[PDB]
Amino acid sequence: GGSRCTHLENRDFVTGTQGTTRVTLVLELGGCVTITAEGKPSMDVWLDAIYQENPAKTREYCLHAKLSDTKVAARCPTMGPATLAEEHQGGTVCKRDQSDRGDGNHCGLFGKGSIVACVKAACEAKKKATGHVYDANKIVYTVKVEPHDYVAANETHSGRKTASFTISSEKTILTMGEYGDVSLLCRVASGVDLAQTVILELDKLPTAWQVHRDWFNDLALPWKHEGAQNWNNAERLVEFGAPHAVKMDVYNLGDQTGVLLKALAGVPVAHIEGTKYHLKSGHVTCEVGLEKLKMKGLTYTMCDKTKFTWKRAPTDSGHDTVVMEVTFSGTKPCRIPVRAVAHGSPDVNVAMLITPNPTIENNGGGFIEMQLPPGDNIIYVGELSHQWFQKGSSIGGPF
Amino acid sequence: GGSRCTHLENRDFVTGTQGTTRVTLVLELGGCVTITAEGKPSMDVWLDAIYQENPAKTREYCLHAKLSDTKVAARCPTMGPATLAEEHQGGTVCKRDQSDRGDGNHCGLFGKGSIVACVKAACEAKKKATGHVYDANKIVYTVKVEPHDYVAANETHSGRKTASFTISSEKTILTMGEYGDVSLLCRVASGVDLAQTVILELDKLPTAWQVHRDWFNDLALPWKHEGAQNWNNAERLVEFGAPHAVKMDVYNLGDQTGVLLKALAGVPVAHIEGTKYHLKSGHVTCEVGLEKLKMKGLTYTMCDKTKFTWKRAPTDSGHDTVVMEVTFSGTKPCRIPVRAVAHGSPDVNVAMLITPNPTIENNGGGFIEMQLPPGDNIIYVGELSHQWFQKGSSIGGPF
Amino acid sequence: GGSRCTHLENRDFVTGTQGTTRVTLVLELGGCVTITAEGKPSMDVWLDAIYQENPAKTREYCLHAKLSDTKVAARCPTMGPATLAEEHQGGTVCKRDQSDRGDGNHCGLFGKGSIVACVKAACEAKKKATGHVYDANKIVYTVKVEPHDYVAANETHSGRKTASFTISSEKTILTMGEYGDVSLLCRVASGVDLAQTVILELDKLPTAWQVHRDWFNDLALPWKHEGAQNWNNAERLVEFGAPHAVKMDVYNLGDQTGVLLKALAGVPVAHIEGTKYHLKSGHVTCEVGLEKLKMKGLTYTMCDKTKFTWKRAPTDSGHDTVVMEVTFSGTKPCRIPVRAVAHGSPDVNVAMLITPNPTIENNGGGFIEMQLPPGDNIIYVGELSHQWFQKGSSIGGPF
Amino acid sequence: ATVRKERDGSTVIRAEGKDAATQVRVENGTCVILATDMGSWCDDSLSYECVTIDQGEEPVDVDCFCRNVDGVYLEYGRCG
Amino acid sequence: ATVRKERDGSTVIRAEGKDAATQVRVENGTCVILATDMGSWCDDSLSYECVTIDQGEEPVDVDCFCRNVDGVYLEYGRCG
Amino acid sequence: ATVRKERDGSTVIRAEGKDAATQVRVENGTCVILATDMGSWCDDSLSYECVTIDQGEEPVDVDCFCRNVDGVYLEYGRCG
């Protein structure tokens, strides 16, 4: 088996005079809570997924330019200026210079003549760095509730109830079988600052990343929008040669996918399940309204501080948070005594836990996710300790 | 008459041992809730308006350039470079080229001479595409409470109490007459992702739109800021001609208001009431604190699934949500059984309701507002169904 | 002494049938609340600090360019184009023009020759306008609770408990001595719209400011990123001279720190405590879960409307809010009757209070912080009045 | 067409659409206007040099030329 | 190399890497190709003028020149 | 002013404000400095060519000229 589901505490709910019970739940991504009533079967409530189905395409950058139909026009020093039809056309890069002219290139007077070279600038197939922006109100927070048996893939779980939430959508009523009609009011909260977030995706090893807004907008590469035929700032990959009598060569600066991947090393990888653009960080704080029932609350005792060992040493989660796993040898179940101090002051708690109630359960438990301030810090799990260095906030590598 | 006001359910409130009652309300824009106490008159609580009074001017784009005082300066091939006073002046577009010179234009030596043409670039009257950015903390959420009679325009409603809220301002105490002192704690939530929002307004048919941040910043038009005299990137509407002996003509690229309106087709229209910049989407979740009273709660029964018909078929609201109206022939009042499934899986609810409690009331009711995932979906109102195709997230048309 | 701490009201908490007490607190920055239980000592709960430890460097602007190793290359009118190694090098500004050539500069044919001048463009020491972007989820909201005595600097306060919160981290359990285990669920809310916020900092009188995103990104100055060696758009401070036979001089446009400071006049000053980037505006709304105790609630009576005088007249706080101090001559303690009306309608309350419960306490009290709509408004503190003109939303001065 | 002495040493001719393919007398010499893109006077106006060509010299790539009079310019509005 | 009359009055020569340092007959005259940066025909192609130089005139700073034939251009793909 | 042979074939003269309107001997010839925008040596330095003008040829639009010595350049700091 192995269930992380945390039993409901007495402090989390209040029973009114008129028989109404207001159960307050903190549901992180993957985090489960067991709610039980006197005589009614145990129900597991959890936040299943945080995602946005196919978000808007902001900017698409060209990594490798597709140059075609290059034309060079030139005239004698006494004759008029050299002109091309591509100069007043879209998706073309043109350069105007002066070429040395004489009798060797058939011109009556020795001097400088007008020369212009134009090339149709486009993008090579499967060589685009597309960007995606999240719409805060469009992100779905799937909350699922099932009884505390295994059922096949095609068949559905008996008693399973699905309730999706957003910033705009907050209240829904569920017919939770034995519990009757329950009012679910789930407050949505993202674990990623969506405002300063862009999903950099390459045409189909990682091919999608969660990059910063400021890093993305300042990429020195030709860009365009979803629907546009031509490329803006196409000269970023076009290099013109020296102007000869009637010839002016055009050079491609080459592929920039390798230059991009080097700067994208260490950048948090984006999670795309088909069309669903998932966010691996975030939570949902719900307030369940129950009627005509007595709630069964189980308050936790503190775990033995001396009986703790590291199952998995504190490491980076991959979304600016710290993850750790602990092994407890004492009596189960209990509440994990977890805190942290910044190197210098050992009396002020600096731990900002993502896990609302870290507990050692009868079956499983022991997973702790937390936020720590930058610099050298010491994480304490009772008597058990570990030094962690949190890296400072960054937008990305230089380009 | 016709009131949409939904009666308070037993699940929404809890009565304490010390006599305190905590009533939890979900108030969407236009959405009303009726709160009643034993012996006290019924009170209608609703969110009246979501707006920001005259937000900050970000960027102002020029649609039609006002060209004036064009000057052309030229010198012989042996003489020094041609100079103009406007070259080192603000709000001017200058181009440097080579002109063919000889005896026909009075120059001792046949060759190429220096030529420069300068034009004072400004904007034509009533031809500006001004942008406005919302300050999340400055948006007012007006909450009004009145007794459940008609009063004149100049005269005020007896018993009406107004309470405005923001992200910063959350707690206020109202002297709700018969109910005494009530503590209102309203949590503010926008229905629009303000971070990726710009209000594109034209000088005074729609003249204001709610455009995306990324679409607005990448507009290929000359721009400036509120207070600046000169225009940045003014060459975007200025086209210089071929360089003749002493003449170089300047051409205006014309009006771009028509090009903008074509790209703005289908874009959600902005709502401006004088100086108030309204947001037609959003809600406010309040927690009312009452003392020395017994609350009257009326729990709803489910409506008859077979007795439903479409008053107004599911359509786009105009702010990325789906609106629908239903007609019920059975017994009133009741709670609307509304759900939705994505084409493929008919067991998972994909409906994300904006309306917290859709109900068929004695007088009115039957309005349902909801969020749906992109693609082909089927909306269910009991037995009554309708297929809806939600369009994918977009920033706007190409420019 | 002088304590602003506001005693807990009966409306703010509810005692359940099973003995659980849910205390709801509104904690603004600096704002304190006194929570007391029957037989247990009084505890002062307050929001100590709102900050982010060293946020990400977005863009760094150069105010004074450091020009070095200027090289000029020129060739005769019949000879090939003039080339320099610095043209295809990073962090260099190059200009190509035509120079008058003849026998006086040793050239066989009279005409126009190719000339190119290159300069290594960098930034002068301590002359950078660095920008910082806040990560909404990384901002720490320090909540402290101590008993209602003075202790030394090195020694710690007996009974003091620290609990830090973010958008991601919301639930923590505190062992509040006599009160036992208390569940703290603090909802984080910023007083600044972080999405449209950039911290403009100069190299070490104010040296740090809270500027708007749109104002910062449109600064006409050479820019680069944290880690980059070269400067983008370096030509913004480089002015090339007239092209002579073999010489082309380069001019520096000078220091722009004085031009920046003039535009930064009136802009809200940023608060940096070493590495902590503080936000002087914001609040935290908590829901304390208590067990096995009886809560002592003290409900306030309204202050005498006629007995009010201004201690400090309404003025700008320095973070888009209005601050005021009042003196009360009547009986203490009581709740301040404070409201506001916009010039025209004297029946609609336009006051949006930052202070959740303004009260005249036995010792101190009388501080009122509020948000007001733009235009002429009249603030009322009972019978006592004052006219205030709130300025419209702005991004900053012109550059 | 109006002939006037500006703030500079230059002599400025302010002409309109009616002055196209006409001759105007400037000081001790004569000036010929051949500009076809002319119109009524307004803010949107183009100003350039009227080349002082020598004895019997034919004009090449120019729409304004003068004889016996030096330092002469032409200005016209394009609102017609 | 293929000789053809385009939509314009110009005569276009489509050459490849094999046509480097070779001579092609165009109408009543002859054209010489000296371009070294040649290759197989594709979308990425460069097109320029083949200067019609007079009797006994030596070519200066050009890789394509023609005799007795006017208005002649050269095009080649760079996919080799 | 200091005369030196660089990494290239060019002969470089490093002069200051005192070297304005003075003559320096370079190899078998002589070099004349007329630059007025000179100063003390620093990072902010301008470098250009000193044109080798023929027998009795007068200098036109140049502040540095040399006689009997070819491939000669001048460099000076602008920190004065």
Author numbering:
A (entry chain A), B (entry chain A), C (entry chain A): -1 to 146, 149 to 204, 209 to 403
D (entry chain D), E (entry chain D), F (entry chain D): 1 to 80
Provide excerpts from the study.
The flavivirus envelope glycoproteins prM and E drive the assembly of icosahedral, spiky immature particles that bud across the membrane of the endoplasmic reticulum. The immature flavivirus particles that bud into the ER lumen display prM/E protomers in which the pr moiety binds at the domain II tip to cap the fusion loop, avoiding its insertion into the ER membrane. Maturation into infectious virions in the trans-Golgi network involves an acid-pH-driven rearrangement into smooth particles made of (prM/E)2 dimers exposing a furin site for prM cleavage into “pr” and “M”. The flavivirus particle’s life cycle includes three key steps: 1- budding into the neutral pH environment of the ER lumen; 2- transport across the trans-Golgi network (TGN), where the pH is mildly acidic and where the particles undergo a maturation step before exiting to the neutral pH extracellular environment;19,20 and 3- entry via receptor-mediated endocytosis into a target cell, where the mildly acidic endosomal pH triggers E-driven fusion of the viral envelope with the endosomal membrane. The fusogenic conformational change of E is irreversible, and the consecutive steps outlined above require a special particle maturation mechanism in order to avoid premature fusion-triggering in the acidic TGN during exocytosis.
We therefore tested TBEV sE dimer destabilization by mutating Trp101 of the fusion loop, which makes important interactions at the sE dimer interface, into aspartic acid. The prMe-linker-sEW101D construct crystallized at low pH with sE in the post-fusion trimer-of-hairpins conformation instead of a dimer, with pr bound to the sides of the trimer via the same intra-protomer contacts with domain II observed in the (pr/sE)2 complex.
